[PDB]
From a paper:
Here, we present InCellCryst, an advanced pipeline for producing homogeneous microcrystals directly within living insect cells. We have demonstrated the pipeline on five different proteins (IMPDH, HEX-1, Cathepsin B, Luciferase and EGFP-µNS), representing a selection of soluble proteins of different source organisms that crystallize in insect cells in their native compartment or, in case of peroxisomes, readily in the cytoplasm or nucleus of the cells. Importantly, as shown for IMPDH and HEX-1, InCellCryst can produce crystals from native protein sequences, without purification tags or even remnants of proteolytically removed tags, within a quasi-native cellular environment. The rich source of biomolecules in the cellular environment allows the identification of native ligands by co-crystallization at quasi physiological conditions, representing a unique feature of InCellCryst.
The unmodified IMPDH (ori) as well as variants without the native (cyto) or with an artificial PTS1 motif crystallize within the cytosol, but no crystallization can be observed when the protein is translated into the ER. IMPDH crystallized with or without a PTS1 signal (peroxisomal import) in the cytosol, forming thick needles with a square base, similar to the unmodified version of the protein. The unit cell parameters of all IMPDH crystals remained unchanged as verified by SAXS-XRPD. All IMPDH structures show natural ligands at the canonical binding sites 1 and 2 in the Bateman domain. However, instead of guanosine monophosphate (GMP) found in the IMPDH N-His structure solved from isolated crystals, the structures solved in this study allow a clear identification of GDP in the canonical binding site 2, stabilized by hydrogen bonds to Lys133 and Arg101 that coordinate the α-phosphate and β-phosphate of GDP. In addition, a phosphate is bound to the IMP binding site of the catalytic domain of the IMPDH structures. As observed in the previously published IMPDH structure solved by SFX20, the canonical binding site 1 incorporates an ATP molecule. However, we observed two conformations of the bound ATP, where the gamma phosphates of the adjacent ATP molecules are either opposing or facing each other. We were able to identify naturally bound ligands and their conformations in the canonical nucleotide binding sites of the IMPDH ori and cyto structures, at a resolution of 2.3 and 2.4 Å, respectively. The second binding site is unambiguously occupied by GDP, instead of the previously proposed GMP20, demonstrating that crystal isolation and storage can alter the information obtained due to hydrolysis of the ligand.
Numbering used by the authors:
A (entry chain A): 103 to 321, 330 to 405, 440 to 493
B (entry chain A): 3 to 321, 330 to 405, 440 to 493
C (entry chain A): 440 to 493
D (entry chain B): 3 to 321, 330 to 403, 440 to 493
Write the structure that this text describes.
Amino acid sequence: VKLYRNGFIMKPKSVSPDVPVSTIRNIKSEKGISGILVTEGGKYDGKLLGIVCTKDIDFVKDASAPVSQYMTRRENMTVERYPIKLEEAMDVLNRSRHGYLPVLNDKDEVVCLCSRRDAVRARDYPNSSLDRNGHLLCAAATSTREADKGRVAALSEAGIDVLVLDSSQGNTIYQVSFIRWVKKTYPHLEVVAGNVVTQDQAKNLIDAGADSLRIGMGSVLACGRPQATAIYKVARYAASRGVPCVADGGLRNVGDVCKALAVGANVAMLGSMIAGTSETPGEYFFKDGMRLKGYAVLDKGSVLKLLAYIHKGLQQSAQDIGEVSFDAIREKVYEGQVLFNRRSLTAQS
Amino acid sequence: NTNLRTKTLRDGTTAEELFSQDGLSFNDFIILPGFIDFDSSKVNVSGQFTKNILLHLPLVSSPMDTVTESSMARAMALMGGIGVIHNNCTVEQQARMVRSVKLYRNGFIMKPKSVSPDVPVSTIRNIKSEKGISGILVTEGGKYDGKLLGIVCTKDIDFVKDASAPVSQYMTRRENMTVERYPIKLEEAMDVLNRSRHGYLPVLNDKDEVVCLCSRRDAVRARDYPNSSLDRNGHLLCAAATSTREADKGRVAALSEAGIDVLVLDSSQGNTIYQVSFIRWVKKTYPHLEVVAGNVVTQDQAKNLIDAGADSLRIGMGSVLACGRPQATAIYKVARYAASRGVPCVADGGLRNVGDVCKALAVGANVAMLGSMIAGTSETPGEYFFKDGMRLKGYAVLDKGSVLKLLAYIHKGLQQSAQDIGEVSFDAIREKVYEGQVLFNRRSLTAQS
Amino acid sequence: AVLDKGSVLKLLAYIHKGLQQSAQDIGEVSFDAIREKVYEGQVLFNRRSLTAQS
Amino acid sequence: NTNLRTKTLRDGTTAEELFSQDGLSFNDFIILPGFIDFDSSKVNVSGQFTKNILLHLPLVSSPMDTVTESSMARAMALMGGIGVIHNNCTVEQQARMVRSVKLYRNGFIMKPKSVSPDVPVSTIRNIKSEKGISGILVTEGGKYDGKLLGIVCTKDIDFVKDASAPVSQYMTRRENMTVERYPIKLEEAMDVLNRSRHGYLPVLNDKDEVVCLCSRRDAVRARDYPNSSLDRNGHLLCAAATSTREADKGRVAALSEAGIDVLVLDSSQGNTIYQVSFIRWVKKTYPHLEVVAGNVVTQDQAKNLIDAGADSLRIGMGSVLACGRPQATAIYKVARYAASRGVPCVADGGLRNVGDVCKALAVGANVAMLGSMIAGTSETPGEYFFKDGMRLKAVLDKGSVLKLLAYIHKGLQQSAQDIGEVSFDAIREKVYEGQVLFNRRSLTAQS
Ligand SMILES: Nc1ncnc2c1ncn2[C@@H]1O[C@H](COP(=O)(O)OP(=O)(O)OP(=O)(O)O)[C@@H](O)[C@H]1O
Ligand SMILES: Nc1ncnc2c1ncn2[C@@H]1O[C@H](COP(=O)(O)OP(=O)(O)OP(=O)(O)O)[C@@H](O)[C@H]1O
Ligand SMILES: Nc1ncnc2c1ncn2[C@@H]1O[C@H](COP(=O)(O)OP(=O)(O)OP(=O)(O)O)[C@@H](O)[C@H]1O
Ligand SMILES: Nc1nc2c(ncn2[C@@H]2O[C@H](COP(=O)(O)OP(=O)(O)O)[C@@H](O)[C@H]2O)c(=O)[nH]1
Ligand SMILES: Nc1nc2c(ncn2[C@@H]2O[C@H](COP(=O)(O)OP(=O)(O)O)[C@@H](O)[C@H]2O)c(=O)[nH]1
Ligand SMILES: Nc1nc2c(ncn2[C@@H]2O[C@H](COP(=O)(O)OP(=O)(O)O)[C@@H](O)[C@H]2O)c(=O)[nH]1
């Protein structure tokens, strides 16, 4: 997730000259990156020798041939010398009509790499959630046991921006200790504690140092809480203390997501609603004349189209409510200017 | 962690407010979570069956002829609960079932089953097949207190082809038997039994007459069932049902002779003059007996039956007659009133899953009565049959397998629920519910989907 | 059309016995008594939630 | 292993006996297994769509306005089948769809899309988004044969914010272009294009005017779809439907100009004087066209339509409602009669799963027409929308038709394997010979 989008591509995937074309095809097929640099000994910081792109090997019949036979050789490559501002480098890339632009030191060793694909990703996805280095934001879940400490470190090395604690009932001493320890050891990390449904639980986990709370429990065990009430109560208390909340569960259509956001949740967690989209894990199969996903659910197509659909739905709902933002809706709900009506059981038909 | 466990915001609804409006069933509300600082294994689910009887496992088998006979009561007692032998039978049958339950587990086995030397092996096989006891003593004239002559065990007759042969032909003879002389402490006797690698150890007087008997099977039962509900003599606890008519007096006596520890009154509406008189008479005549009065659903009824001297109350009525009460409201109200007067209550009815049992115990019931939930387990009365490719029980219900596995499942479920609630015992849950520290939420009809 | 319920006399006796058993469970020996005690607040009720009717 | 494969006991029922009584559907019978000595990968499912057109994949997209337009026909032809563009449109729209299918894949592109230098970038973006072609040539006056001035590709305009700018500002200009001079063999031209690492190679005369254009995308399409149904010039095969009225004559002409290779007559009951006259007129006026007559269900209708000069027959009627025939019987009877006269048949209707398609092909059909089975795939006409959390187009989204066609392919292969023959031509022959046998299933025997 983190290295898909970059400005300057650090540690660019590179190979040695004797590598077979089969390896470059494998790189493109599994990991999906082109423009492989060919360097001294394949080290990502070695002397730049060449580059291998899509059109350089799409015609070759002997997949065992070395890339040096078909790579574009360094003397013929447009390159840049460190230092360079990303803005100038990407304008150079644009003017060059090429897909990639390496940046080298005085010894022709590979310092970094600019990809036109990143420019086009930025153009086609102008609202991407990004960190300060131009990478996509990524969160990761973990339990709060003692072993999971290791996990956290690893994820911190991988570059997660948010840690999310996984628990059906998050108001535990183990989770409080874990939040304290995470904020102490990895101050750069933000933690989403939970799960909770009462303002007690929220108090404990916010006192521990939680930066956000996951609301939901039950959306045979006799313990839980109706989800809309839980969201309103916990989100109100947390907002009084400056902490946003995530609605997690019972979110099955767009009206429910809009309602959950209006009554206090800042963001909404989607599980069932997006399960079976093309981007989820699992293999597709045909059965009974229906496309399904298995380790079953119905194919909903691209998650991108679904996200845009939900976006437009939330916008139209906010419009009908008469406010131009959902922060405004939350503020005016707490203020008593956005109003509701409880529906009798009959009125829901 | 009292700072972390103690709710000050108190975001939720207390039981008193929850049950202040219309009558509720268990699906109408849910329990809110608390604070966890312990593993679910450490949770104590015990509850009082009566003023004086605490059950490690707060579960009681219902006194229906389709649920509780000797076998079910034994299983319940072994898992830490108790069973109520149904009263749809003669006094003699009920007393025999009670005896089956009470003499299954012993320390010293009094009146050990014994036979005379001329008895055929067929008789010993019958004893093992019907009543399930081995290690039959062979004595003078078959009297259980006669001179000890020998012992007959499983391996002594499992190879014999002439079932008419006398046991004296194959019994282990007394001169070769490890025995003990009265007096002896049970501890020393059972250690001797262990060291001897044998299954049985008789205890005799100076005349070699049988005083009593120790069984290794009792040691292994104690090891495999460490939480068994026991009386002070090492026997399994047993309860028995009876109506409150005048004839049933006889029944009571018989059951008292059989050794019941709890008498349970059987009535759809227990707030009657006949039941009040019966409770008075039972407490007067058999002070050692504890009585579970009922059934009731209002605090009026509870007052009358507790004034009569009830040691516990069965709650439930309706879980075409127009009279009854939603079960959760009934449980909360009656259990609160009875607890104010020091009497525990049994939830009887409408208990169909583990969440309902947990809720019923949290809102005031000390123990829960199971009928439908355990009907069709291997230990209930009735014969198994195959039909439509399904195993069913008949005098129909689906086979649920062993009641022991089901009881352990319910135990683990109650423990996990108590953990999620944030209390390490159900007595604690009840106290904190009355205190307003365990909170609830009423669920709209829509919120139950 | 309707299903045969047999004699109305047997049905009336059935309803009679049912009313008697209900009054007994309620704890009053007459329905005039039940009405009086209902107005007096000594015969009590419980409203049933929609769930409690199952 | 002919000794092991050859049935002598012949425990089973032959097709002739099976279809000798009442009219059957596909669920009324099952095919008995034979002898296996091969992998399903080696099974040839190909079938004749017409007397002269063999399809690597015996699948035809139905000419319904909800199933087959240019995109569906392209997918079918690419996977080794073919599509029939529906006739629920004007003649010009149908001809445009046919042209799209025919000019999607080329060797030499003879009429390469061209623009004049003053055209805005927005127009090239529109071309790429609507028609899906890049490497637009910029020539004198925008004529596809004018003097070559430059070329516009993806990376030449992906960064510009002023969409009204002329292409002359950003195009790759002629002086810097790798080009070739007419004449040149396609083999050498495309190898040169490969070595050049570019996406396009114009071919010009001595006057620098555009003769034609080679596209790397065509090479890669040939590599990724080696079994595409193609004509002799490297274009995808395309069929188009038409009614048999007198006005439709015009329609036919237009389609002939657009380059269809097969005409398909649209009628619930094709044994009419109008259809006979239409077939005669088509074979006389446009001999290069092959005609699939229909629809028919009896051998009398087939006799008339074959005498008229039909190259293939569409089977199906009923798969108010008083006229028709159970589809499996119709297929067996008509396909047997037509095969006796050297005409293949298309199964049209009641084909709802892979077992049904396999049965229909085994009992005589050379190819099978797909309608419902492929409705709702990404390549069908219509817009997708969300409802009740399901995505629909109404029918449910089935994803890519290509993956579904591959699924059907593997299914037919595995079925043929279990039957014990390495091709469906062999299966049909052995069915007529009595060496592939069947069993009718009682109504209870169906579960
Ligand atoms: N900085 C560069 N200098 C010189 N040649 C380059 C440079 N970057 C890429 N190339 C070459 O451009 C030629 C065409 O690029 P190619 O199409 O193969 O991959 P791409 O630029 O990533 O775009 P796409 O994969 O979508 O076609 C290749 O031969 C490639 O080696
Ligand atoms: N106190 C004893 N002294 C001598 N022999 C004994 C004594 N108790 C039992 N035995 C004998 O031990 C032998 C083996 O015991 P046996 O297996 O038949 O029954 P068990 O001890 O109850 O165990 P199990 O029935 O499970 O096999 C028998 O011959 C039995 O008579
Ligand atoms: N014959 C040519 N001579 C010189 N430059 C060319 C020639 N053809 C294309 N180019 C240029 O090289 C690049 C063409 O890349 P390419 O043809 O692979 O683009 P495409 O077909 O639109 O798809 P993609 O680039 O994404 O693979 C552009 O910069 C283009 O101006
Ligand atoms: N050549 C090239 N490398 C890229 C591109 N995008 C990202 N990378 C880098 O390629 C690397 C992916 O391979 P790598 O992580 O080293 O292998 P792994 O250790 O098995 O996961 C990462 O270092 C990315 O940063 C690209 O577009 N072209
Ligand atoms: N020999 C033997 N007797 C046992 C054992 N366990 C219990 N008993 C006694 O065996 C007797 C069972 O038979 P009994 O009650 O006398 O016959 P009943 O009057 O028809 O019920 C009881 O007295 C039990 O106490 C055992 O393990 N071995
Ligand atoms: N520049 C270019 N032209 C192509 C390519 N593939 C097909 N064409 C041609 O582009 C033309 C597109 O149709 P056109 O007649 O220009 O538009 P229409 O009048 O609306 O049908 C066709 O003549 C195709 O032959 C390609 O890859 N690059």
